[PDB]
Amino acid sequence: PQITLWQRPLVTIKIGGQLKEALLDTGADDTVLEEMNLPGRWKPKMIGGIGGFIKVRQYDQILIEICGHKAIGTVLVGPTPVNIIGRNLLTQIGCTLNF
Amino acid sequence: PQITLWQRPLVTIKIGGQLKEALLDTGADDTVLEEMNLPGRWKPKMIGGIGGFIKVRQYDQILIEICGHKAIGTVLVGPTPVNIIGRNLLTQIGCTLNF
Ligand SMILES: COC(=O)N[C@H](C(=O)Nc1ccccc1CC[C@@H](CO)NCc1ccc(N)cc1)C(c1ccccc1)c1ccccc1
Ligand SMILES: [Cl-]
Ligand SMILES: [Cl-]
Ligand SMILES: [Cl-]
Ligand SMILES: [Cl-]
């Protein structure tokens, strides 16, 4: 699809068999979701935002469907203001910016 | 152009007679630049995201050239870690997300 930016680019994602709403964010290097349960082991990660840095949990090789497109990659979990899909997964779904 | 997301989508901008590098950020509602002087009236604003909030100066009706495309809009100035071009100006240059 082609998504204009007059409104926030919010889409439905599916992770762990559940639907969630998430923002397609070209300004984010990584994908960070609000507190949730994910399988396996996690590693520590610090991510920097507009207000400073936060600690998150890094889970690797996680299945996630974004706007119907399947991806398998790194998902961070922590106190983000909104669920964010970052460039690590936008590249998997073949997303580009165009003007 | 078609901008890949393999790397951060950094482009050259021209504002207040200054050439700067800025990030095309679909996850940003507003445009926020690192400290600089801008003409006209301003009002304070708080913007928030990962790590919390920062205080910025809000300038309206500011002319900006983004990767050769002219746009006018509100520009926020403050302690952002990177210059961000948000949706308020991405729409003006006809920027869309495609996959
Ligand atoms: C050390 O930092 C880095 O290595 N990368 C930074 C990075 O990618 N952060 C990151 C990582 C995972 C998930 C989300 C984000 C930022 C979400 C932003 C992007 O959308 N929301 C902005 C926003 C949205 C809404 C509101 N209301 C307010 C703000 C990056 C940057 C930081 C701040 C702002 C823009 C980019 C960065 C890039 C280059 C140089 C330094 C930092
Ligand atoms: Cl942020
Ligand atoms: Cl990944
Ligand atoms: Cl505006
Ligand atoms: Cl349009």
PDB file of N, CA and C in Angstrom, chain B residues 4-74:
ATOM      1  N   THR B   4      15.550   4.526   0.637  1.00  0.00           N
ATOM      2  CA  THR B   4      15.691   3.241   1.264  1.00  0.00           C
ATOM      3  C   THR B   4      15.679   3.389   2.799  1.00  0.00           C
ATOM      4  N   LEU B   5      15.298   2.325   3.521  1.00  0.00           N
ATOM      5  CA  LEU B   5      15.324   2.362   4.992  1.00  0.00           C
ATOM      6  C   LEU B   5      16.435   1.478   5.557  1.00  0.00           C
ATOM      7  N   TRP B   6      17.368   1.029   4.690  1.00  0.00           N
ATOM      8  CA  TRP B   6      18.503   0.246   5.173  1.00  0.00           C
ATOM      9  C   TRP B   6      19.358   1.108   6.121  1.00  0.00           C
ATOM     10  N   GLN B   7      19.393   2.432   5.872  1.00  0.00           N
ATOM     11  CA  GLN B   7      20.103   3.409   6.700  1.00  0.00           C
ATOM     12  C   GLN B   7      19.091   4.442   7.176  1.00  0.00           C
ATOM     13  N   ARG B   8      19.483   5.260   8.151  1.00  0.00           N
ATOM     14  CA  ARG B   8      18.600   6.315   8.620  1.00  0.00           C
ATOM     15  C   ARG B   8      18.323   7.260   7.441  1.00  0.00           C
ATOM     16  N   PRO B   9      17.044   7.643   7.213  1.00  0.00           N
ATOM     17  CA  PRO B   9      16.729   8.527   6.056  1.00  0.00           C
ATOM     18  C   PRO B   9      17.088   9.988   6.341  1.00  0.00           C
ATOM     19  N   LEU B  10      18.385  10.281   6.269  1.00  0.00           N
ATOM     20  CA  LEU B  10      18.922  11.621   6.505  1.00  0.00           C
ATOM     21  C   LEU B  10      18.991  12.375   5.204  1.00  0.00           C
ATOM     22  N   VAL B  11      18.482  13.607   5.213  1.00  0.00           N
ATOM     23  CA  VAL B  11      18.511  14.448   4.023  1.00  0.00           C
ATOM     24  C   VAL B  11      19.017  15.843   4.363  1.00  0.00           C
ATOM     25  N   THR B  12      19.382  16.615   3.327  1.00  0.00           N
ATOM     26  CA  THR B  12      19.810  17.987   3.561  1.00  0.00           C
ATOM     27  C   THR B  12      18.587  18.880   3.530  1.00  0.00           C
ATOM     28  N   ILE B  13      18.540  19.813   4.470  1.00  0.00           N
ATOM     29  CA  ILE B  13      17.490  20.801   4.541  1.00  0.00           C
ATOM     30  C   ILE B  13      18.135  22.192   4.488  1.00  0.00           C
ATOM     31  N   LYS B  14      17.336  23.188   4.116  1.00  0.00           N
ATOM     32  CA  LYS B  14      17.756  24.592   4.103  1.00  0.00           C
ATOM     33  C   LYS B  14      16.710  25.351   4.928  1.00  0.00           C
ATOM     34  N   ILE B  15      17.156  26.014   6.008  1.00  0.00           N
ATOM     35  CA  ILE B  15      16.278  26.762   6.906  1.00  0.00           C
ATOM     36  C   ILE B  15      16.997  27.978   7.470  1.00  0.00           C
ATOM     37  N   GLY B  16      16.341  29.138   7.403  1.00  0.00           N
ATOM     38  CA  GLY B  16      16.894  30.404   7.900  1.00  0.00           C
ATOM     39  C   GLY B  16      18.247  30.730   7.295  1.00  0.00           C
ATOM     40  N   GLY B  17      18.439  30.313   6.047  1.00  0.00           N
ATOM     41  CA  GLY B  17      19.680  30.510   5.298  1.00  0.00           C
ATOM     42  C   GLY B  17      20.795  29.560   5.706  1.00  0.00           C
ATOM     43  N   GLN B  18      20.457  28.490   6.463  1.00  0.00           N
ATOM     44  CA  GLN B  18      21.428  27.501   6.957  1.00  0.00           C
ATOM     45  C   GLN B  18      21.176  26.115   6.340  1.00  0.00           C
ATOM     46  N   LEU B  19      22.250  25.389   5.982  1.00  0.00           N
ATOM     47  CA  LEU B  19      22.154  24.021   5.439  1.00  0.00           C
ATOM     48  C   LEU B  19      22.380  23.096   6.622  1.00  0.00           C
ATOM     49  N   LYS B  20      21.454  22.153   6.835  1.00  0.00           N
ATOM     50  CA  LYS B  20      21.524  21.221   7.954  1.00  0.00           C
ATOM     51  C   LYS B  20      21.142  19.811   7.485  1.00  0.00           C
ATOM     52  N   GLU B  21      21.446  18.790   8.283  1.00  0.00           N
ATOM     53  CA  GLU B  21      21.051  17.416   7.965  1.00  0.00           C
ATOM     54  C   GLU B  21      19.899  17.105   8.891  1.00  0.00           C
ATOM     55  N   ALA B  22      18.855  16.429   8.370  1.00  0.00           N
ATOM     56  CA  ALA B  22      17.723  16.111   9.220  1.00  0.00           C
ATOM     57  C   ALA B  22      17.150  14.750   8.867  1.00  0.00           C
ATOM     58  N   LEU B  23      16.488  14.136   9.842  1.00  0.00           N
ATOM     59  CA  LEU B  23      15.924  12.806   9.683  1.00  0.00           C
ATOM     60  C   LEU B  23      14.461  12.865   9.240  1.00  0.00           C
ATOM     61  N   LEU B  24      14.081  12.142   8.164  1.00  0.00           N
ATOM     62  CA  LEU B  24      12.671  12.086   7.722  1.00  0.00           C
ATOM     63  C   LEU B  24      12.020  11.095   8.667  1.00  0.00           C
ATOM     64  N   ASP B  25      11.135  11.606   9.549  1.00  0.00           N
ATOM     65  CA  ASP B  25      10.590  10.822  10.650  1.00  0.00           C
ATOM     66  C   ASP B  25       9.096  10.657  10.643  1.00  0.00           C
ATOM     67  N   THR B  26       8.608   9.520  10.077  1.00  0.00           N
ATOM     68  CA  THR B  26       7.153   9.337  10.037  1.00  0.00           C
ATOM     69  C   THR B  26       6.500   9.130  11.417  1.00  0.00           C
ATOM     70  N   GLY B  27       7.305   8.818  12.422  1.00  0.00           N
ATOM     71  CA  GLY B  27       6.782   8.627  13.768  1.00  0.00           C
ATOM     72  C   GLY B  27       6.672   9.932  14.530  1.00  0.00           C
ATOM     73  N   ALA B  28       7.134  11.061  13.935  1.00  0.00           N
ATOM     74  CA  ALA B  28       7.082  12.362  14.594  1.00  0.00           C
ATOM     75  C   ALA B  28       5.883  13.163  14.124  1.00  0.00           C
ATOM     76  N   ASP B  29       5.046  13.662  15.048  1.00  0.00           N
ATOM     77  CA  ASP B  29       3.930  14.482  14.573  1.00  0.00           C
ATOM     78  C   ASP B  29       4.448  15.844  14.095  1.00  0.00           C
ATOM     79  N   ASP B  30       5.491  16.347  14.794  1.00  0.00           N
ATOM     80  CA  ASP B  30       6.047  17.665  14.570  1.00  0.00           C
ATOM     81  C   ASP B  30       7.506  17.638  14.153  1.00  0.00           C
ATOM     82  N   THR B  31       7.971  18.776  13.627  1.00  0.00           N
ATOM     83  CA  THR B  31       9.348  18.966  13.177  1.00  0.00           C
ATOM     84  C   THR B  31      10.073  19.641  14.338  1.00  0.00           C
ATOM     85  N   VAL B  32      11.246  19.073  14.741  1.00  0.00           N
ATOM     86  CA  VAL B  32      12.010  19.603  15.875  1.00  0.00           C
ATOM     87  C   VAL B  32      13.456  19.646  15.507  1.00  0.00           C
ATOM     88  N   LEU B  33      14.045  20.838  15.638  1.00  0.00           N
ATOM     89  CA  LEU B  33      15.443  21.027  15.283  1.00  0.00           C
ATOM     90  C   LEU B  33      16.243  21.406  16.501  1.00  0.00           C
ATOM     91  N   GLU B  34      17.544  21.073  16.462  1.00  0.00           N
ATOM     92  CA  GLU B  34      18.489  21.415  17.529  1.00  0.00           C
ATOM     93  C   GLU B  34      18.553  22.945  17.609  1.00  0.00           C
ATOM     94  N   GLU B  35      19.051  23.468  18.730  1.00  0.00           N
ATOM     95  CA  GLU B  35      19.098  24.903  18.942  1.00  0.00           C
ATOM     96  C   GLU B  35      19.601  25.721  17.786  1.00  0.00           C
ATOM     97  N   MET B  36      18.809  26.731  17.447  1.00  0.00           N
ATOM     98  CA  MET B  36      19.088  27.678  16.374  1.00  0.00           C
ATOM     99  C   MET B  36      18.174  28.876  16.553  1.00  0.00           C
ATOM    100  N   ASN B  37      18.508  29.982  15.883  1.00  0.00           N
ATOM    101  CA  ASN B  37      17.688  31.183  15.941  1.00  0.00           C
ATOM    102  C   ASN B  37      16.690  31.178  14.764  1.00  0.00           C
ATOM    103  N   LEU B  38      15.449  31.600  15.027  1.00  0.00           N
ATOM    104  CA  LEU B  38      14.421  31.696  14.001  1.00  0.00           C
ATOM    105  C   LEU B  38      13.704  33.025  14.143  1.00  0.00           C
ATOM    106  N   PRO B  39      13.202  33.610  13.037  1.00  0.00           N
ATOM    107  CA  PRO B  39      12.530  34.908  13.157  1.00  0.00           C
ATOM    108  C   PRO B  39      11.092  34.798  13.647  1.00  0.00           C
ATOM    109  N   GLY B  40      10.561  35.916  14.125  1.00  0.00           N
ATOM    110  CA  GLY B  40       9.178  36.003  14.569  1.00  0.00           C
ATOM    111  C   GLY B  40       8.874  35.588  15.990  1.00  0.00           C
ATOM    112  N   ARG B  41       7.577  35.525  16.285  1.00  0.00           N
ATOM    113  CA  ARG B  41       7.077  35.175  17.615  1.00  0.00           C
ATOM    114  C   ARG B  41       7.224  33.694  17.874  1.00  0.00           C
ATOM    115  N   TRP B  42       7.273  33.312  19.152  1.00  0.00           N
ATOM    116  CA  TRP B  42       7.332  31.898  19.519  1.00  0.00           C
ATOM    117  C   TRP B  42       6.596  31.678  20.820  1.00  0.00           C
ATOM    118  N   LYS B  43       6.229  30.433  21.081  1.00  0.00           N
ATOM    119  CA  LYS B  43       5.587  30.106  22.347  1.00  0.00           C
ATOM    120  C   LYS B  43       6.155  28.803  22.863  1.00  0.00           C
ATOM    121  N   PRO B  44       6.198  28.597  24.179  1.00  0.00           N
ATOM    122  CA  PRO B  44       6.790  27.353  24.685  1.00  0.00           C
ATOM    123  C   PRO B  44       5.855  26.157  24.502  1.00  0.00           C
ATOM    124  N   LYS B  45       6.453  24.971  24.404  1.00  0.00           N
ATOM    125  CA  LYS B  45       5.717  23.711  24.224  1.00  0.00           C
ATOM    126  C   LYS B  45       6.526  22.607  24.852  1.00  0.00           C
ATOM    127  N   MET B  46       5.850  21.526  25.276  1.00  0.00           N
ATOM    128  CA  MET B  46       6.510  20.330  25.793  1.00  0.00           C
ATOM    129  C   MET B  46       6.184  19.207  24.831  1.00  0.00           C
ATOM    130  N   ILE B  47       7.198  18.481  24.374  1.00  0.00           N
ATOM    131  CA  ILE B  47       7.005  17.352  23.471  1.00  0.00           C
ATOM    132  C   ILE B  47       7.608  16.139  24.126  1.00  0.00           C
ATOM    133  N   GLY B  48       6.944  15.009  23.964  1.00  0.00           N
ATOM    134  CA  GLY B  48       7.398  13.817  24.657  1.00  0.00           C
ATOM    135  C   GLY B  48       7.470  12.588  23.820  1.00  0.00           C
ATOM    136  N   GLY B  49       8.304  11.672  24.272  1.00  0.00           N
ATOM    137  CA  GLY B  49       8.509  10.400  23.603  1.00  0.00           C
ATOM    138  C   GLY B  49       9.310   9.502  24.500  1.00  0.00           C
ATOM    139  N   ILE B  50      10.134   8.652  23.893  1.00  0.00           N
ATOM    140  CA  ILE B  50      10.940   7.752  24.699  1.00  0.00           C
ATOM    141  C   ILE B  50      11.884   8.601  25.551  1.00  0.00           C
ATOM    142  N   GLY B  51      11.969   8.290  26.835  1.00  0.00           N
ATOM    143  CA  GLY B  51      12.818   9.023  27.750  1.00  0.00           C
ATOM    144  C   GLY B  51      12.114  10.185  28.420  1.00  0.00           C
ATOM    145  N   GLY B  52      10.917  10.527  27.962  1.00  0.00           N
ATOM    146  CA  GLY B  52      10.167  11.616  28.578  1.00  0.00           C
ATOM    147  C   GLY B  52      10.002  12.843  27.712  1.00  0.00           C
ATOM    148  N   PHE B  53       9.864  14.002  28.344  1.00  0.00           N
ATOM    149  CA  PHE B  53       9.590  15.235  27.616  1.00  0.00           C
ATOM    150  C   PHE B  53      10.719  16.236  27.616  1.00  0.00           C
ATOM    151  N   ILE B  54      10.708  17.104  26.614  1.00  0.00           N
ATOM    152  CA  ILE B  54      11.643  18.230  26.533  1.00  0.00           C
ATOM    153  C   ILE B  54      10.849  19.506  26.230  1.00  0.00           C
ATOM    154  N   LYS B  55      11.350  20.651  26.719  1.00  0.00           N
ATOM    155  CA  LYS B  55      10.732  21.948  26.464  1.00  0.00           C
ATOM    156  C   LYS B  55      11.353  22.494  25.168  1.00  0.00           C
ATOM    157  N   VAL B  56      10.512  23.013  24.278  1.00  0.00           N
ATOM    158  CA  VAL B  56      10.939  23.555  22.995  1.00  0.00           C
ATOM    159  C   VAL B  56      10.248  24.888  22.734  1.00  0.00           C
ATOM    160  N   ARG B  57      10.771  25.646  21.765  1.00  0.00           N
ATOM    161  CA  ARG B  57      10.163  26.899  21.335  1.00  0.00           C
ATOM    162  C   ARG B  57       9.413  26.587  20.052  1.00  0.00           C
ATOM    163  N   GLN B  58       8.150  26.976  19.991  1.00  0.00           N
ATOM    164  CA  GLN B  58       7.334  26.756  18.813  1.00  0.00           C
ATOM    165  C   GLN B  58       7.265  27.994  17.926  1.00  0.00           C
ATOM    166  N   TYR B  59       7.772  27.887  16.664  1.00  0.00           N
ATOM    167  CA  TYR B  59       7.736  28.980  15.670  1.00  0.00           C
ATOM    168  C   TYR B  59       6.793  28.558  14.564  1.00  0.00           C
ATOM    169  N   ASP B  60       5.859  29.411  14.200  1.00  0.00           N
ATOM    170  CA  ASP B  60       4.925  29.068  13.141  1.00  0.00           C
ATOM    171  C   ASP B  60       5.273  29.736  11.812  1.00  0.00           C
ATOM    172  N   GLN B  61       4.714  29.201  10.706  1.00  0.00           N
ATOM    173  CA  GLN B  61       4.885  29.753   9.358  1.00  0.00           C
ATOM    174  C   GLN B  61       6.364  29.918   8.987  1.00  0.00           C
ATOM    175  N   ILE B  62       7.141  28.854   9.177  1.00  0.00           N
ATOM    176  CA  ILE B  62       8.560  28.865   8.855  1.00  0.00           C
ATOM    177  C   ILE B  62       8.759  28.166   7.528  1.00  0.00           C
ATOM    178  N   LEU B  63       9.537  28.823   6.648  1.00  0.00           N
ATOM    179  CA  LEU B  63       9.868  28.321   5.331  1.00  0.00           C
ATOM    180  C   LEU B  63      11.034  27.325   5.474  1.00  0.00           C
ATOM    181  N   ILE B  64      10.913  26.188   4.833  1.00  0.00           N
ATOM    182  CA  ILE B  64      11.924  25.151   4.878  1.00  0.00           C
ATOM    183  C   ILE B  64      12.027  24.450   3.523  1.00  0.00           C
ATOM    184  N   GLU B  65      13.239  24.165   3.080  1.00  0.00           N
ATOM    185  CA  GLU B  65      13.435  23.448   1.840  1.00  0.00           C
ATOM    186  C   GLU B  65      13.980  22.083   2.236  1.00  0.00           C
ATOM    187  N   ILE B  66      13.276  21.007   1.846  1.00  0.00           N
ATOM    188  CA  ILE B  66      13.644  19.648   2.211  1.00  0.00           C
ATOM    189  C   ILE B  66      14.004  18.866   0.994  1.00  0.00           C
ATOM    190  N   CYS B  67      15.289  18.472   0.894  1.00  0.00           N
ATOM    191  CA  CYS B  67      15.756  17.671  -0.225  1.00  0.00           C
ATOM    192  C   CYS B  67      15.211  18.292  -1.560  1.00  0.00           C
ATOM    193  N   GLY B  68      15.318  19.626  -1.661  1.00  0.00           N
ATOM    194  CA  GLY B  68      14.893  20.427  -2.809  1.00  0.00           C
ATOM    195  C   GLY B  68      13.428  20.801  -2.954  1.00  0.00           C
ATOM    196  N   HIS B  69      12.573  20.396  -2.001  1.00  0.00           N
ATOM    197  CA  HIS B  69      11.132  20.675  -2.029  1.00  0.00           C
ATOM    198  C   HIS B  69      10.780  21.706  -0.964  1.00  0.00           C
ATOM    199  N   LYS B  70      10.050  22.747  -1.361  1.00  0.00           N
ATOM    200  CA  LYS B  70       9.648  23.798  -0.439  1.00  0.00           C
ATOM    201  C   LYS B  70       8.429  23.393   0.364  1.00  0.00           C
ATOM    202  N   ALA B  71       8.418  23.822   1.631  1.00  0.00           N
ATOM    203  CA  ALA B  71       7.327  23.543   2.553  1.00  0.00           C
ATOM    204  C   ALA B  71       7.305  24.671   3.571  1.00  0.00           C
ATOM    205  N   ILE B  72       6.135  24.954   4.120  1.00  0.00           N
ATOM    206  CA  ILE B  72       5.982  25.973   5.169  1.00  0.00           C
ATOM    207  C   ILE B  72       5.246  25.294   6.303  1.00  0.00           C
ATOM    208  N   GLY B  73       5.624  25.614   7.535  1.00  0.00           N
ATOM    209  CA  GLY B  73       4.940  25.030   8.678  1.00  0.00           C
ATOM    210  C   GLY B  73       5.559  25.390  10.001  1.00  0.00           C
ATOM    211  N   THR B  74       5.049  24.763  11.046  1.00  0.00           N
ATOM    212  CA  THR B  74       5.566  24.992  12.399  1.00  0.00           C
ATOM    213  C   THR B  74       6.868  24.231  12.587  1.00  0.00           C
TER     214      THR B  74
END
